[PDB]
Amino acid sequence: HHHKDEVALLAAVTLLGVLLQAYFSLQVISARRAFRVSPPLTTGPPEFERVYRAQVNCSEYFPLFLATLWVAGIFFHEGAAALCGLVYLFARLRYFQGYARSAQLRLAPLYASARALWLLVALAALGLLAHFLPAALRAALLGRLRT
Amino acid sequence: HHHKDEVALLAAVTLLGVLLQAYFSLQVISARRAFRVSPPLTTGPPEFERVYRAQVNCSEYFPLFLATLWVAGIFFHEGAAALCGLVYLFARLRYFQGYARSAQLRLAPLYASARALWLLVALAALGLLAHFLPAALRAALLGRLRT
Amino acid sequence: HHHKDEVALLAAVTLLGVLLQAYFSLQVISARRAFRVSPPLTTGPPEFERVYRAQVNCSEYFPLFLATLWVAGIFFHEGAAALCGLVYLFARLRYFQGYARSAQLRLAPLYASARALWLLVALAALGLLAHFLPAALRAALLGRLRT
Ligand SMILES: N[C@H](CCC(=O)N[C@@H](CSC[C@H](O)CCc1ccccc1)C(=O)/N=C\C(=O)O)C(=O)O
Ligand SMILES: N[C@H](CCC(=O)N[C@@H](CSC[C@H](O)CCc1ccccc1)C(=O)/N=C\C(=O)O)C(=O)O
Numbered sequence: 178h179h180h181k182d183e184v185a186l187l188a189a190v191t192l193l194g195v196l197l198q199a200y201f202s203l204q205v206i207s208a209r210r211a212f213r214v215s216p217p218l219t220t221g222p223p224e225f226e227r228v229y230r231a232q233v234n235c236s237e238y239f240p241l242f243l244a245t246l247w248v249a250g251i252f253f254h255e256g257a258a259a260l261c262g263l264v265y266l267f268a269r270l271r272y273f274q275g276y277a278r279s280a281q282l283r284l285a286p287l288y289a290s291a292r293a294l295w296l297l298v299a300l301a302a303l304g305l306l307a308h309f310l311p312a313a314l315r316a317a318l319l320g321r322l323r324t
Numbered sequence: 325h326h327h328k329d330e331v332a333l334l335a336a337v338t339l340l341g342v343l344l345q346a347y348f349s350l351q352v353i354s355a356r357r358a359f360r361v362s363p364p365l366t367t368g369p370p371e372f373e374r375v376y377r378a379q380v381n382c383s384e385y386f387p388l389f390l391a392t393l394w395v396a397g398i399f400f401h402e403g404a405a406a407l408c409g410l411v412y413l414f415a416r417l418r419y420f421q422g423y424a425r426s427a428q429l430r431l432a433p434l435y436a437s438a439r440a441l442w443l444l445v446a447l448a449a450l451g452l453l454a455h456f457l458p459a460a461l462r463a464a465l466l467g468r469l470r471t
Numbered sequence: 472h473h474h475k476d477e478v479a480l481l482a483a484v485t486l487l488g489v490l491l492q493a494y495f496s497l498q499v500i501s502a503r504r505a506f507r508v509s510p511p512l513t514t515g516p517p518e519f520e521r522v523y524r525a526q527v528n529c530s531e532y533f534p535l536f537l538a539t540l541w542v543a544g545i546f547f548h549e550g551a552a553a554l555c556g557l558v559y560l561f562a563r564l565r566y567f568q569g570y571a572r573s574a575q576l577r578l579a580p581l582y583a584s585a586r587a588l589w590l591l592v593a594l595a596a597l598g599l600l601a602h603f604l605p606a607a608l609r610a611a612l613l614g615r616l617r618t
């Protein structure tokens with residue numbers, strides 16, 4: 178008996194996220210050509226540094242997204258976690274698109290991505306609490322008994 | 325019944341990757357000493373910034389590698405995924421070695437690493453498709469029936 | 472039968488790590504306000520670049536921590552891995568706090584975090600070795616037999 182069925186949506190969202198990250202990377206390389214910035218060195222016109230920074234930030238947050246997605250999806254509910262992941266990834270795509278154009282336009286999609294990530298965190302926290310809190314509470318009651 | 329046996333190669337490749345990352349970090353610190361760059365601050369002679377950038381880029385890609393490795397290894401085939409992972413990690417080591425010497429010498433091993441990563445992605449995609457596409461197709465046919 | 476029970480501590484430590492990372496990010500944003508640095512652009516007074524760099528470095532190491540934690544926890548022992556993870560995360564929090572104040576004060580907690588990470592690596596290595604080495608040794612003996 179395989180557990181592929183229990184995690185296939187998490188794996189699919191994860192893969193979509195990877196693909197999206199690849200997209201961000203290629204867009205940064207395209208900004209390296211457009212605005213004549215050769216490796217190493219990550220300075221140039223404002224628009225390049227903005228595109229670059231959007232990609233860097235997405236990259237920095239991508240493992241946080243994965244960790245919470247998987248923990249939430251396993252401990253709370255797979256579908257909810259996957260949905261939140263989709264909302265997050267769409268929000269991040271919009272973030273990247275915004276940032277590339279103007280610092281201010283990254284902001285609205287940025288906020289959407291953060292809410293989804295905290296929602297993933299809260300589900301993770303609730304799921305873990307549901308797992309640990311009953312056994313812990315019971316053990317404390319047993320000692321209290323005793324009398 | 326443990327599932328260690330089904331994922332031991334993925335875990336081994338993962339650990340090798342971690343070790344390799346540790347190696348990149350220590351090489352960067354060594355460049356910080358050689359070329360007199362004290363923390364914080366990541367600017368100095370060209371050779372330091374190149375070594376530094378090789379490490380940074382490897383670090384940025386390392387979670388993408390892990391995600392696709394695991395998804396491909398679970399959904400498609402463990403051995404193939406591990407092999408691709410080994411090729412990728414070797415390619416990245418060569419990338420780092422190249423970059424440290426000259427921007428242009430990172431390029432050949434860079435290309436090898438990218439092909440292996442996309443190969444991992446394609447296996448992940450195929451594996452997930454194999455999981456989801458039949459059930460989805462059947463459900464669509466059932467509605468078509470109906471008549 | 473679920474395997475949540477076998478990985479719940481790893482998941483909890485992982486989530487704590489995510490929360491800690493969120494904390495580092497918010498502290499960096501607070502340094503962006505205090506020392507008047509607007510996005511993109513990551514240069515300003517020394518204290519901002521130090522806080523920023525502490526966060527960046529923690530972020531760079533966070534997936535390495537996760538990978539080894541999970542591999543060690545599954546292949547060697549869950550509790551040991553979780554404990555090492557807790558020590559690591561506390562060490563990193565202290566690292567961030569130190570760095571924010573002075574480059575030199577990040578150093579003591581930095582060393583604590585590295586020992587814990589290498590301890591995780593060693594457990595991962597030992598666990599994987601325990602899994603692979605017997606079967607490999609037996610296979611070699613069988614060929615030796617033969618005679
Ligand atoms: N800081 C920017 C970041 C952009 C980037 O990292 N682009 C990739 C290359 S993009 C080629 C393909 O998109 C490969 C990425 C990929 C991602 C997920 C799955 C498969 C492939 C890259 O240059 N990697 C290493 C290096 O800088 O030498 C830069 O300097 O290039
Ligand atoms: N940007 C470069 C990056 C190199 C780096 O990150 N080196 C490590 C230290 S290298 C020591 C050992 O190699 C620990 C790393 C390790 C990795 C995987 C498993 C076990 C240990 C480090 O300095 N970490 C935090 C900090 O900058 O304060 C730098 O400024 O140091």
Ligand SMILES: N[C@H](CCC(=O)N[C@@H](CSC[C@H](O)CCc1ccccc1)C(=O)/N=C\C(=O)O)C(=O)O
Nearest residue numbers: 234241287291294295298489492493496497499500
């Ligand atoms: N280089 C620093 C890094 C700090 C940082 O990344 N802060 C977060 C925002 S902090 C808001 C919440 O803390 C969300 C983070 C979070 C982490 C884990 C779980 C849930 C939420 C951020 O700015 N992200 C994207 C962007 O720069 O546009 C900077 O320029 O902001």
Ligand code: NI
Nearest residue numbers: 180327472474
């Ligand atoms: Ni099972």
